[PDB]
RNA sequence: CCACAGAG
């Protein structure tokens, strides 16, 4: 599972990741080295371009919001920059030079009498291409196009309207020409996302989960030195999944950061547990890494010790911004007169055969009739009684 | 379900309803349909409601019940060696009902040194908060792990680890709440008895109270796993090697 | 009004409408539009 | 790989058994009003209750 | 990219300690386990804040389109 | 009594037990004379940015309330809004604005006023509530550099944009009331950005005051936490070589040896982070036990530079008192 | 009274799509029923499927 | 025109130091081995046969 | 012998006694010998000569 | 003039004779509820006192107080608030004296 | 050579009319979202984002019992949460 | 219209 899900980690892509204009790119603001490395990591130079941050995790049941793999993020930690990510998207356009000796045009802008442009062109600029560094909201235009209507020559408007649930920002606007002499314009839009509810966080030992709640840092536990954990995970994910390597990684990372040196967790070897226990004892902590935390709510001592230390988490690309969707009434397919598919085309969810079967099993006739006839494709038709057609 | 409105861009459902959906919070996407006619809406709420579907029709056993991390906290409260004074007991009762239910504190189980209550009395109040509540249940049940008593003639409630629960009146006189008394898959659970005796509303109320209590308790009473819980003792490394 | 920057030579220049997409200090054909002069605001979070 | 075969079997079973219902005379009948069982299970007890 | 201004867990200002940590590593030829403690980084959260950081801005700044490479 | 014991696997007696109804005699009622007689404060150390004081005979709830109010209720001034002109750096606008928002500012927020939000943007900001900071750094290639070196500090002139480059721009009456107390970042060496020739960063930051609950940048304490005073009980005296092993089970300044008897004694307990390593070995079982005093709190308030720590603790106490007074004076409605 | 009430309300309710419920109650355990090796009463080679 | 694969013996990135690699707007820590066609970058995956 | 040698307040033992998550076998595998790996009902097949 | 929406008395839960009540406080959290609970539990006539946050996504606090048959619940709440004010005053005075000492 | 699509091809298969558009079909007034726990919610309750509740609407007919409530909802509009998105007159 | 790639 970790082999499959480490390829979705958000982090630095390359040294020239800012000069690239790719169709979809995920970057992280503050990547960090793993506390527990591996010789394979050193050889493949994953050390130079990491993907993930070390989080002070306290393995305990802080609230009811960590049940079934969910995690408990820290509001102050997110505010200070933990898990901060950005997404870059590319919109391309080509001014085709048609066979009628006519070509598409970019320029165009509409200005109100007061000296302000129209709202749809608020961040368009005087050259018809969106100004670098300007915010783009939903419905605005960043690439203005007008194609000839006869293929003088008139033009019809085909603008590239931005649509999305959150505002973005234009990062680069590149103009060029290809070999066949067509103008090629690429616009890179970046947007900044902070972790919220629904964002997936892995653990480099499987142990995937989503942020079930975000709580303020005065509510989380704290040790004697005042360290407040960033992410609190449910202990119940350990005994069934049997990941002792996670506990060894936590203790190795704690002993390494206290000693000041990165510690190696190479397969079939690595830094042993006994040296970690010796370093932790010499630093004044417990030999097994379980400290005493005071509760943040009731303020008193927790009745059991809490396993406490750094673990390297990765933020994954399955954020809730790209997953939430709702239709109500929208576009319909031409052939079947039914709602379309895919949230890109504002489609609707499919009530498949087995959902129909379950609704049958309940016996709710009227609900099934409403769901499969009235709300999807109802149609009044005239049928002849004599012939049945 | 009945809709509530919350500002966090994710659907949220109680974890006790996770088991029938077979859903885990690891990226699961779930669907929401809204009926558009009064007949469909009424049929949905009175046939497919969570309260009217506490039992799976495959065998009749409960399938909507306490999942993991609710069983653990309930067990830790109902442990034999856990005792609470008036302040902590009252705080526990306030957390399970949001300070809305009128409680009546039963006489404490320990009186002479201090006035100490038992967690089993806390669950006795969880089932029946006051005299106005009509929930009165009685049941004898085994637990998942059960050590027989020291002799073959004693009743099952006198077990060594107290793995037998007896509920008379509404008090819990023995046993620890685990995945045979609050969980799913067994026909002698507390919630199943409450359902079959007093309809689904009382079962839902007790379930909500348990969920709130176990959500707000384990934060103020830590429960952790570490390598100290997995490292074998010194003598085990010899016996295992010899065997 | 300087508005365009060549990719490799980094010479700010303005394109007249009757001129090709090409830098005039070299042969490069990549032009990145310069940052706007308009004010943009940001909340610190 | 179990999922494909299990789903196919479930679909076949549900297509076969979708028409049965317990009529008001306590007899399980098909859609075409033919009796499969005279009483459900021999005693007419829902496994739910 | 660049060193964070504040430590994630507690909130101590550690952005200023990065240059001093590099200087103590280079011209003072000390192991980092002592250089971290010299700069007042007592808690291990502030230690991991700059011990694990990658100075990616130096690598990024080679590809500067504002000046000829 | 009031000693929370420490065992090798569990922590017992962790709750307060001083209230009537806890016992038959029903003592320990609330009498402010007794609390005034018993409560004590010992300030062991106090620097310009850190305080360490012990509260004695106070309940856990009050101390935790003080800690929470210190962390996320004492207001402080931080950079809220950033306006950008010509930011050509590699660091993006959002990241740079966040980094500017995260720096601490050495101002007294008692000289400012809270910001109303319902007013329009052209009237919300006045001279009583905002502080304007200006950053304007343009990098350029340094011509007279030594050819044998590649240090970024020498090749260029403004390679490292620090935090002290945030100059303070007075607006109106701030030119008078901020005479002897100019606005300055608390730590001027914070590395805001890195530059290369041809790049420029210019921006104006509007600075208001908020609470730590809204955002973590407004928290006036870098650290505000307490620990119970540890306590070590040596029941059977420990003699000879094993006592040295006992000395090895604790931090160096904790437990010493008496040369007149070669036995271990507790030199000091305040230096003991509870590691309970002594509970690992059977040779000390039923000889030494560990505990903490449930009503002896050692605070450790490390400020962010905006305030003295004793001012922060006093502000927290006053804020809790004002909360209580506001709830008392409010009417009760159905 | 309790026994009679339980028996009288435990009768199958008319109109219930009992065939659908039975089809699902046979089908869905196939999802959770993983393959495991089986032998018939103390002999190893009988390898019943 | 035969489409060169990156970091081959015929590509411009062969044995190039990180200074010249930075001159060509290419990351030095890039595996190479892929074909840039029509703007996109494609990889011929290693096939396995009997 | 491993399960017998574990004291109370051992977290996997508590989570197995509760039945919330895990079982005796998982604790035995983590603390004691894991046991024979079984593939298709038999031991590991001879992948070489 | 007074903020009538600050603290309310939930009439659905209070007893008819006033010996029990469940007050609702807006724009507060544990930092007041814990101190108020600890102070009110030191009232000898208070038999039940407990706070809760019904949902962390909304800023709200529910505190329930039940007394014996001698005093009402509103009197217990006001006495607890007064005692909390006095306790904060004592702590403030001691800290002022000790910081003047150094 | 690509085979053409005939009527038998349009009526058969998992994407045919019978198993793709008649037995089950895509429906209106639906939403798909990632889930997260909430123990303080009752078991018969599901929490919906307001960003979804502003889109998914329930058509309520005006009666003598809810006239004031629906008037207030219409006054509120489609931007604030408790409100309405469309109105359909009786005769229109 | 297909084919990849992931999410349960
Ligand atoms: C408008 C609010 C004023 C407030 C912030 C002013 C007015 C009263 C002031 C305190 C008192 O002077 C007593 C102490 C004197 C010591 O030297 C430093 C700390 C000390 C606690 C003071 C801090 C601070 O300076 C206070 C609270
Ligand atoms: Mg899942
Ligand atoms: Zn006809
Ligand atoms: Zn050029
Ligand atoms: Zn820190």
Q: Which domains does chain E have, with CATH numbers?
A: 1-66 (1.10.10.60)
Cα I38 to averaged position of ligand 2 atoms, centre (Å): 26
Please tell me whether residue E34 adopts helix, strand or coil conformation: helix
3 state SS for chain J: CCCCCCEEECCCCCCCCCCEEEEEEECCCHHHHHHHHHHHHCCCCEEEEEEECCCCCCCEEEEEEEECCCCCHHHHHHHHHHHHHHHHHHHHHHHHHHHHHC
Atom of ligand 1 nearest to the CA of F318: 27
CA nearest to C6, candidates F322, F138, E67: E67
Query: Which residues in chain K are closer than 8 Å to A327, comparing Cβ atoms?
Result: 28-31, 55-56
Q: Do residues D10 and A354 make contact, with C-beta atoms less than 8 angstroms apart?
A: yes
Please tell me whether residue F191 adopts helix, strand or coil conformation: strand
Residues 6+ apart with CB under 8 A from G42: none
Cα J94 to averaged position of ligand 1 atoms, centre (Å): 14
Phi, psi (deg, nearest 5) at residue A34? -65, 140
Please tell me whether residue F97 adopts helix, strand or coil conformation: helix
d(CA A373, CA K28): 11
d(CA B122, CA B114): 17
- Going by DSSP bridges, is the β-strand pair F76-85/B2-6 parallel, antiparallel, or unpaired? unpaired
Sign of the CA dihedral running F211, F215, F221, F225: positive
Q: Do residues E55 and A34 make contact, with C-beta atoms less than 8 angstroms apart?
A: no
Give the domains, in start order, of chain C with CATH numbers: 3-45 (2.20.28.30)
State the DSSP code for A372: I
Q: How many CB atoms lie within 10 A of CB A340?
A: 18
d(CA A274, CA F309): 41
- Going by DSSP bridges, is the β-strand pair K45-49/B2-6 parallel, antiparallel, or unpaired? parallel
Q: Tokens 């009232």 belong to which residue? A: J43
| Nearest residue on chain A to B76, alpha-carbon basis | A303
DSSP class per residue in B157-168: GG-SS--EEEEE
Residues 6+ apart with CB under 8 A from B99: J13, J22, J50, J51, J52, J62, J63, J64
Q: Tokens 């130096």 belong to which residue? A: E58
Q: Is A66 a catalytic residue?
A: no
Q: Distance of CA B146 to CAs A239, B123, I17, Å?
A: 21, 21, 9
Q: Which two three-digit tokens encode residue J94?
A: 């001691």
Q: Which two three-digit tokens encode residue B123?
A: 């669950």
CA nearest to F98, candidates F270, F215, F240, F10: F215
d(CA A102, CA B93): 79
CA nearest to F303, candidates E10, E9, J94: E10
Q: Do residues G14 and D24 make contact, with C-beta atoms less than 8 angstroms apart?
A: yes
CA nearest to F63, candidates A304, J38, J57, B151: J38
Catalytic residue of the set A69, A171, A230, A291:
A69
Q: Which nucleotides of L are covered by protein (CB under 7 A)?
A: 1-2, 6-8
| Residue C11 exposed, middle or buried by CB count within 10 Å (0-12, 13-18, 19+) | middle
Domains of chain J: total: 1
Q: Which two three-digit tokens encode residue I30?
A: 């983590």
Q: Do residues F240 and F262 make contact, with C-beta atoms less than 8 angstroms apart?
A: yes
What CATH number did the domain enclosing J19 receive? Answer: 3.30.1360.10
Query: Which sequence spans correspond to the domains of chain F?
Result: 29-75+217-334, 76-216
Half-sphere exposure of B1 (CA within 13 A, CB side): 20
> What's the CATH code, domain F29-75+217-334?
3.30.1360.10
CA nearest to B216, candidates B10, B77, B61: B77
Residues 6+ apart with CB under 8 A from A176: A183, A184, A185, A186, C21, C29, C30, C31
3 state SS for I2-48: CCCCCCCCCHHHHHHHHCCCCCHHHHHHHHCCCCCCCECCECCCCCC
3 state SS for chain K: CCCCCCHHHHHCCCCCHHHHHHCCEECCCEEEEEEEECCCCCCCEEEEEHHHHCCCCCCCCCCCCCHHHHHHHHHHCCCCCCCCCCCCCCCC
Residues 6+ apart with CB under 8 A from J1: none
* F near B: at least 3 beta-carbon pairs less than 8 Å apart: yes
| Residue A261 exposed, middle or buried by CB count within 10 Å (0-12, 13-18, 19+) | middle
Breaks in chain C listed by the residue before each, with C–N > 2.5 Å: none
CA nearest to C41, candidates A133, A190, A195: A133
Choose the closest CB to B10 out of K34, K56, K59. K34
State the DSSP code for A315: B
Cβ density class F220-235: b for 16+ within 10 Å, e for less: bbbbbbbbbbbbbebe
Please tell me whether residue F34 adopts helix, strand or coil conformation: helix
DSSP class per residue in B210-240: HHHHHHHHTTTS-----GGGTSPPTTHHHHH
Kindly determine whether residue G23 and residue D44, on different chains, have CB atoms separated by under 8 Å. Answer: no
| Residue A295 exposed, middle or buried by CB count within 10 Å (0-12, 13-18, 19+) | buried
* Rg from Cα positions in chain G: 19
Q: Do residues F252 and F268 make contact, with C-beta atoms less than 8 angstroms apart?
A: no
Q: In CATH, which of 3.40.50.300, 2.60.40.740, 2.60.40.1120, 2.170.120.12 is domain F76-216?
A: 2.170.120.12
DSSP class per residue in F271-328: T-----GGGT-GGGTTTEEEEEEEEEEEEEEEE-SSS-HHHHHHHHHHHHHHHHHHHH
| Residue G41 exposed, middle or buried by CB count within 10 Å (0-12, 13-18, 19+) | exposed
d(CA A155, CA A103): 10
Q: How many CB atoms lie within 10 A of CB F290?
A: 21
d(CA G35, CA G49): 10
Calculate the CA dihedral of residues B70, B76, B78, B81 and round it to 10 degrees. 180
| Residue K1 exposed, middle or buried by CB count within 10 Å (0-12, 13-18, 19+) | exposed
Please tell me whether residue E16 adopts helix, strand or coil conformation: coil
Residues 6+ apart with CB under 8 A from F281: F245, F249
Calculate the CA dihedral of residues F67, F68, F73, F77 and round it to 10 degrees. 60
Q: Tokens 């305040």 belong to which residue? A: F270
- Helix or strand holding residue A170 (H, E): strand A168-177
Phi, psi (deg, nearest 5) at residue D14? -75, -35
**Residue to substitute in J99, J100, J102 for testing ligand 1 pocket (most ligand atoms within 8 angstroms of CB):** J99
d(CA A109, CA A114): 15
Length of chain G: 49
CA distance J56 to chain K (A): 9
Choose the closest CB to E9 out of A15, A18, A77. A77
Mutate to test the interface with I, among B72, B165, B177 (most CBs of I within 10 A): B72
Residues 6+ apart with CB under 8 A from E50: E3, E14, E17, E18, E21, E36, E41
CA distance F23 to chain A (A): 21
State the DSSP code for A373: I
Q: Tokens 């219902």 belong to which residue? A: D21
Structure determined via = cryo-EM
Q: Which two three-digit tokens encode residue D21?
A: 């219902």
Sign of the CA dihedral running F255, F257, F258, F264: positive
> Which domain, by its residues, includes J38?
1-102
d(CA H11, CA G39): 63
Please tell me whether residue A94 adopts helix, strand or coil conformation: strand
Q: Tokens 């409960």 belong to which residue? A: B62
Q: Which two three-digit tokens encode residue F84?
A: 């950008």
Q: Which two three-digit tokens encode residue A329?
A: 């009434």
Sign of the CA dihedral running A116, A117, A120, A126: negative
Residue with CA nearest to L2's C1' atom: K2
d(CA A75, CA F215): 8
Strand partners, A200: A210
CA nearest to F62, candidates B222, D44, J37, K24: J37
Please tell me whether residue D20 adopts helix, strand or coil conformation: coil
Q: Which two three-digit tokens encode residue A94?
A: 């080509």
Strand partners, A97: A103
d(CA B76, CA F171): 61
d(CA F106, CA F185): 6
Kindly determine whether residue K45 and residue B212, on different chains, have CB atoms separated by under 8 Å. Answer: no
Beta strand ranges found along chain F (DSSP E): 3-6, 11-12, 40-46, 50-56, 76-85, 131-138, 160-162, 167-169, 191-194, 200-210, 221-234, 255-258, 263-266, 288-303
Strand partners, B165: B141
Cβ density class K15-33: b for 16+ within 10 Å, e for less: eeeebbbebbbbbbbbbbb
d(CA A271, CA A248): 10
d(CA F11, CA I49): 59
Residue with CA nearest to L8's C1' atom: B28
Sign of the CA dihedral running J72, J73, J74, J80: positive
Resolution reading in Å: 3.4
Q: Do residues C45 and A194 make contact, with C-beta atoms less than 8 angstroms apart?
A: yes
| Residue A144 exposed, middle or buried by CB count within 10 Å (0-12, 13-18, 19+) | buried
Please tell me whether residue B148 adopts helix, strand or coil conformation: coil
Q: Do residues A260 and I36 make contact, with C-beta atoms less than 8 angstroms apart?
A: no
Q: Do residues A162 and A136 make contact, with C-beta atoms less than 8 angstroms apart?
A: yes
Phi, psi (deg, nearest 5) at residue J100? -70, -30
Cβ density class F309-332: b for 16+ within 10 Å, e for less: bbbbbbbbbebbbebbeebbebee
Q: Do residues A383 and K64 make contact, with C-beta atoms less than 8 angstroms apart?
A: no
* E near D: at least 3 beta-carbon pairs less than 8 Å apart: no
Length of chain C: 45
CA nearest to A155, candidates A203, A107, A85, A94: A107
d(CA F171, CA F127): 6
C-alpha of A80 from chain center: 19
Any idea what the Cα angle at residue C25 is, between residues C21 and C31, rounded to 5°? 35
Length of chain K: 92
State the DSSP code for A38: -
Q: Do residues H24 and H12 make contact, with C-beta atoms less than 8 angstroms apart?
A: yes
d(CA F75, CA E16): 24
Q: Distance of CA A350 to CAs A372, K13, K24, K26, K29, Å?
A: 10, 17, 7, 4, 11
d(CA A42, CA A266): 10
d(CA F60, CA F69): 14
CA nearest to E1, candidates E59, E52, E58, E56: E56
Q: Do residues I19 and A240 make contact, with C-beta atoms less than 8 angstroms apart?
A: no
Please tell me whether residue C12 adopts helix, strand or coil conformation: strand
Q: Do residues A132 and A150 make contact, with C-beta atoms less than 8 angstroms apart?
A: no
Residues 6+ apart with CB under 8 A from A248: A265, A273, B227
Strand partners, A117: A111
| Residue E49 exposed, middle or buried by CB count within 10 Å (0-12, 13-18, 19+) | buried
d(CA F234, CA F250): 13
Q: Do residues A7 and A318 make contact, with C-beta atoms less than 8 angstroms apart?
A: no
Q: Do residues A26 and A42 make contact, with C-beta atoms less than 8 angstroms apart?
A: no
Half-sphere exposure of H29 (CA within 13 A, CB side): 18
| Number of CB pairs, chain B paired with chain I, less than 8 A apart | 63
| Residue G27 exposed, middle or buried by CB count within 10 Å (0-12, 13-18, 19+) | buried
3 state SS for F60-85: HHHHHHHHHHHHHCCCEEEEEEEEEE
Strand partners, F160: F194
């Amino acid at each position: 599972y970790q082999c499959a899900m480490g390829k979705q980690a958000i982090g630095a892509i390359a040294y020239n990741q800012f000069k690239r204009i790719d169709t979809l790119l995920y970057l992280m603001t503050y990547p960090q080295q793993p506390m527990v490395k591996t010789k394979t990591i050193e050889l493949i130079d994953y050390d130079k371009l990491p993907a993930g941050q070390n989080a002070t995790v306290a393995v305990m049941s802080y609230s009811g919001y960590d049940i079934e793999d969910a995690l408990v993020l820290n509001k102050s930690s997110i505010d200070r920059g933990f898990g901060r990510c950005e997404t870059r998207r590319k919109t391309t356009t080509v001014l085709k030079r048609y066979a009628n000796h006519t070509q598409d045009i970019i320029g165009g802008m509409r200005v109100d009498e007061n000296g302000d442009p129209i709202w749809q062109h608020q961040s368009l600029g005087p050259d018809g291409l969106g100004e670098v560094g300007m915010k783009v909201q939903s419905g605005q235009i960043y690439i203005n196009k007008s194609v000839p209507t006869n293929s003088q020559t008139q033009y019809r408007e085909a603008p590239v309207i931005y649509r999305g649930p959150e505002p973005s920002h234009i990062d680069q606007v590149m103009m060029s020409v290809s070999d066949n002499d067509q103008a090629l314009i690429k616009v890179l839009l970046r947007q900044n996302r902070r972790p919220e509810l629904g964002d997936k966080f892995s653990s480099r030992h499987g142990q995937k989960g989503v942020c079930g709640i975000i709580v303020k840092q005065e509510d989380m536990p704290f040790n004697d030195q005042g360290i407040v954990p960033d992410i609190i995970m449910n202990p119940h994910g350990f005994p069934s999944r049997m990941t002792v390597g996670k506990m060894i990684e936590l203790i190795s990372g704690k002993a390494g950061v206290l000693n000041g040196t990165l510690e190696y967790g190479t397969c079939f070897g690595g830094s042993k547990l006994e040296d970690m226990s010796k370093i932790l004892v010499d630093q004044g902590f417990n030999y097994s890494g379980k400290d005493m935390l005071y509760s943040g709510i009731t303020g008193e001592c927790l009745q059991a010790y809490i396993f406490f230390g750094p673990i390297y988490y990765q933020k994954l690309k399955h954020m809730v911004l790209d997953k939430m969707h709702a239709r109500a009434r929208g576009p319909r397919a031409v052939l079947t007169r039914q709602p379309t598919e895919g949230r890109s085309r504002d489609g609707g969810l499919r009530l498949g055969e087995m959902e129909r079967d379950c609704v049958i099993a309940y016996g709710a006739s009227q609900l099934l009739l409403e769901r499969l006839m009235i709300s999807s494709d109802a149609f009044e038709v005239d049928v002849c009684d004599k012939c049945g057609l | 379900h009945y809709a509530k409105i919350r500002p966090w861009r994710t659907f949220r459902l109680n974890e006790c309803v996770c088991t029938p959906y077979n859903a885990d919070f690891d990226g699961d996407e779930m669907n929401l349909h809204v009926p558009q006619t009064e007949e469909a809406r009424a049929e949905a709420i009175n046939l497919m409601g969570v309260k009217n579907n506490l039992l799976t029709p495959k065998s009749g056993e409960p399938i909507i019940a306490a999942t993991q991390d609710f069983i653990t906290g309930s067990y830790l409260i109902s442990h034999k060696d856990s005792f609470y004074d008036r302040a902590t007991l009252t705080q526990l009762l306030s957390m399970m009902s949001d300070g809305i239910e009128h409680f009546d504190i039963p006489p404490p189980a320990i009186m002479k040194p201090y006035y100490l209550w038992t967690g089993k009395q806390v669950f006795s109040l969880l089932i029946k908060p006051n005299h106005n509540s009509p929930v009165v249940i009685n049941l004898d049940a085994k637990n998942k792990v059960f050590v027989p008593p020291k002799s073959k003639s004693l009743p099952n409630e006198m077990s060594q680890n107290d793995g037998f629960v007896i509920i008379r009146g509404s008090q819990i006189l023995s046993g620890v709440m685990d995945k045979s008394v609050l969980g799913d898959g067994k026909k002698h659970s507390v919630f199943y008895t409450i359902l079959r005796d007093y309809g689904p509303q009382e079962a839902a109320n007790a379930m909500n109270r348990m969920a709130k209590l176990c959500a707000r308790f384990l934060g103020n009473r830590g429960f952790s796993i570490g390598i100290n819980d997995v490292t074998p003792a010194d003598d085990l490394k010899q016996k295992k090697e010899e065997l | 009004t300087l508005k365009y920057i060549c990719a490799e030579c980094s010479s700010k220049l303005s394109l007249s409408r009757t001129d090709a997409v090409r830098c005039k200090d070299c042969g490069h054909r990549i032009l990145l539009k310069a940052r706007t002069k308009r004010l943009v605001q940001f909340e610190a979070r | 790989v179990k999922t494909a075969e299990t789903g196919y079997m479930s679909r076949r079973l549900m297509k076969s058994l979708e028409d049965l219902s317990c009529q008001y005379d306590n007899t399980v009948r098909t859609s075409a009003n033919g009796i499969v069982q005279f009483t459900y299970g021999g005693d007419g007890l829902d496994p739910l209750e | 990219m660049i060193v964070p201004v504040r430590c994630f867990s507690c909130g101590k200002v550690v952005g200023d300690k990065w240059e001093s940590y590099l200087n103590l590593l280079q011209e003072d030829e000390l192991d980092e386990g002592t250089a971290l403690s010299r700069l007042g980084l007592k808690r291990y959260c502030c230690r991991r804040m700059i011990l694990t950081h990658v100075d990616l801005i130096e690598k990024f700044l080679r590809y500067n389109p504002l000046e000829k490479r | 009594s009031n000693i929370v014991g420490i065992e090798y696997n569990r922590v017992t007696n962790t709750t307060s037990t001083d209230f009537p109804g806890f016992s038959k005699d029903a003592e320990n009622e609330w009498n402010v004379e007794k609390f005034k007689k018993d409560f004590e404060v010992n300030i062991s150390s106090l620097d310009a940015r850190e305080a360490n004081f012990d509260l004695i005979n106070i309940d856990t709830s009050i101390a935790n309330a003080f800690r929470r109010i210190m962390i996320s209720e004492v207001p402080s001034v931080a950079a809220e809004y950033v306006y950008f002109f010509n930011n050509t750096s590699v660091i993006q606008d959002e990241v740079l604005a966040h980094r500017i928002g995260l720096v601490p500012l050495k101002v007294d927020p008692d000289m400012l006023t809270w910001v109303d939000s319902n007013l329009p943007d052209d009237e919300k900001f006045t001279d009583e509530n905002t502080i304007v900071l200006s950053l304007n750094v343009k990098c350029t290639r340094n011509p007279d550099a030594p050819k044998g070196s590649t240090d970024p500090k020498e090749l260029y002139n403004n390679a490292h944009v620090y935090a002290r480059d945030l100059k303070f721009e007075p607006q109106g009456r701030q030119s008078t009331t901020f005479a002897d107390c100019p606005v300055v970042p608390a730590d001027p060496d914070i590395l805001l950005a890195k530059l290369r020739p041809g790049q420029e960063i210019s921006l104006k930051a509007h600075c208001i005051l908020g609470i730590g609950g809204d955002h973590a940048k407004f928290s006036p304490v870098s650290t505000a936490s307490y620990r119970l005073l540890p306590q070590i009980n040596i029941l059977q005296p420990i003699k000879g070589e094993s006592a040295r092993r006992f000395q090895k089970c604790f931090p160096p300044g904790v437990i010493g040896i008496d040369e007149g008897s070669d036995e271990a004694y507790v030199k000091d307990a305040r230096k003991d982070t509870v590691s309970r390593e002594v509970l690992r070995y059977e040779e000390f079982a039923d000889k030494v036990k560990l505990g903490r005093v449930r009503n002896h709190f050692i605070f450790n308030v490390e400020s962010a530079g905006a305030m003295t720590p004793e001012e922060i603790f006093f502000k927290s106490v006053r804020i809790l008192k004002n909360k209580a007074e506001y709830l008392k004076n409010c009417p009760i409605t159905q | 009274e309790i026994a009679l009430f339980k028996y009288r309300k435990a009768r199958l309710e008319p109109g219930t799509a009992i065939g659908a419920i039975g089809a699902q109650s046979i089908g869905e355990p196939g999802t959770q029923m993983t393959l495991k090796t089986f032998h018939f009463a103390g002999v190893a080679s009988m390898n019943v499927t | 025109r035969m489409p060169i694969m990156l970091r081959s013996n015929k590509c411009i990135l062969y044995d190039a130091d990180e200074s010249k690699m930075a001159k060509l707007n290419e990351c030095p820590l890039d595996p190479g081995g892929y074909f840039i066609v029509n703007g996109t970058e494609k990889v011929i995956l290693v096939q396995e046969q009997l | 012998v491993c399960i017998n040698e574990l004291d109370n307040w051992n977290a996997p033992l508590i989570m197995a006694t509760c039945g919330s998550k895990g079982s005796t076998l998982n604790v035995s595998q983590m603390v004691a010998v894991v046991g024979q790996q079984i593939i298709s009902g038999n031991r590991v097949p001879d992948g070489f000569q | 003039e007074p903020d009538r929406e600050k603290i309310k008395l939930l009439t659905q839960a209070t007893s008819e004779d006033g010996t029990s009540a469940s007050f609702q406080i807006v724009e507060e959290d544990h930092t007041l509820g814990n101190a108020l609970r600890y102070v009110i539990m030191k009232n000898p006539d208070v038999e039940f006192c407990g706070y809760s946050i019904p949902h962390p996504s909304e800023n709200l606090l529910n505190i329930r107080i039940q007394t014996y048959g001698e005093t009402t619940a509103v009197d217990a709440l006001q006495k607890g608030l007064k005692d909390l004010m006095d306790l904060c005053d004592v702590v403030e005075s001691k800290f002022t004296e000790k910081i003047k000492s150094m | 050579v690509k085979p053409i699509r005939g009527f038998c091809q349009r009526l058969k298969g998992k994407q045919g009319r019978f198993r793709g558009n008649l037995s089950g079909k895509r429906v209106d007034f639906s939403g798909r979202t990632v889930i997260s726990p909430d123990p303080n919610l009752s078991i018969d309750e599901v929490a919906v984002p307001d960003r979804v509740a502003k889109v998914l609407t329930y058509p309520e007919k005006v009666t003598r019992y809810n006239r004031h409530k629906l008037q207030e909802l219409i006054v509120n509009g489609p931007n604030v949460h408790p409100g309405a998105n469309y109105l359909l007159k009786r005769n229109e």
